[PDB]
Design an enzyme around this catalytic site. Sequence first.
Site, PDB file in Angstrom:
ATOM      1  N   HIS A  16     -16.680  22.185 -40.834  1.00  0.00           N
ATOM      2  CA  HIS A  16     -16.526  22.921 -42.102  1.00  0.00           C
ATOM      3  C   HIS A  16     -15.372  22.327 -42.954  1.00  0.00           C
ATOM      4  O   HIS A  16     -14.456  21.627 -42.435  1.00  0.00           O
ATOM      5  CB  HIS A  16     -16.212  24.388 -41.794  1.00  0.00           C
ATOM      6  CG  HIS A  16     -14.951  24.541 -41.038  1.00  0.00           C
ATOM      7  ND1 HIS A  16     -13.717  24.562 -41.656  1.00  0.00           N
ATOM      8  CD2 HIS A  16     -14.716  24.589 -39.708  1.00  0.00           C
ATOM      9  CE1 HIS A  16     -12.775  24.671 -40.734  1.00  0.00           C
ATOM     10  NE2 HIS A  16     -13.357  24.689 -39.545  1.00  0.00           N
ATOM     11  N   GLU A  94     -15.987  28.464 -33.232  1.00  0.00           N
ATOM     12  CA  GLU A  94     -14.827  27.739 -32.731  1.00  0.00           C
ATOM     13  C   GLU A  94     -14.334  28.345 -31.397  1.00  0.00           C
ATOM     14  O   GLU A  94     -14.610  29.511 -31.080  1.00  0.00           O
ATOM     15  CB  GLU A  94     -13.687  27.764 -33.747  1.00  0.00           C
ATOM     16  CG  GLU A  94     -12.435  26.921 -33.378  1.00  0.00           C
ATOM     17  CD  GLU A  94     -12.650  25.465 -33.020  1.00  0.00           C
ATOM     18  OE1 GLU A  94     -13.402  25.169 -32.067  1.00  0.00           O
ATOM     19  OE2 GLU A  94     -11.982  24.572 -33.627  1.00  0.00           O
TER      20      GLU A  94
END
Length: 247
Positions: A16, A94
């Site tokens: 990202h 994550e």
Amino acid sequence: NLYFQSARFALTVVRHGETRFNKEKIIQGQGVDEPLSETGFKQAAAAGIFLNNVKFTHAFSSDLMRTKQTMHGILERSKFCKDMTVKYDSRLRERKYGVVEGKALSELRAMAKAAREECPVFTPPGGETLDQVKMRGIDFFEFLCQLILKEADQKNCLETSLAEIFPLIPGLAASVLVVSHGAYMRSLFDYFLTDLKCSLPATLSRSELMSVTPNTGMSLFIINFEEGREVKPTVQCICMNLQDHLN
């Protein structure tokens, strides 16, 4: 177990764009679901322009804002995939950092030091181990492989559009786009190298792969299955941490 013919598919994995916390070196795993910063939105747009003529077939993103917004930034600029359905998958999230979520990196390092351990191995209270992260990578990857093989079963163009911008016998069955996170990506890439024994370009060190993931850094893999039942794939790493869209 299902018999499949030989198959090949492309997998592009993109971190990202930058958030406020990335800039400030603040730990961000599964804590505040922080959006992109204006720099992050710019990186996502740049990545979207870089990828505008790539014919992807599938899109998956972590179900966190930073990855969702990046995926949006990319698809909104696509010539062919503007309308593509994104699948949001918690397995792509994550690494958890538990009680150090939202703290300076230095606080995590100090905690490690105090425990007589080193980062990134050290896991704080409420966090995931590297092996737990890798297992989520293995789970997602096996899921993806089965998905693509089954779709190919139930049914140049993809490869040529990749070869246009990336350093590239069955034609590609699919071209999957995945938007995810640095630590998760590193563990997945370690699975591909250490466990699946993927090939690496001459320009890519083992050290690159295991530490280092820039915001919107792009990696491309070709996944290869021989014909048969319960076939172990082989993997070719085409590039890693590409940032040609950012200069």
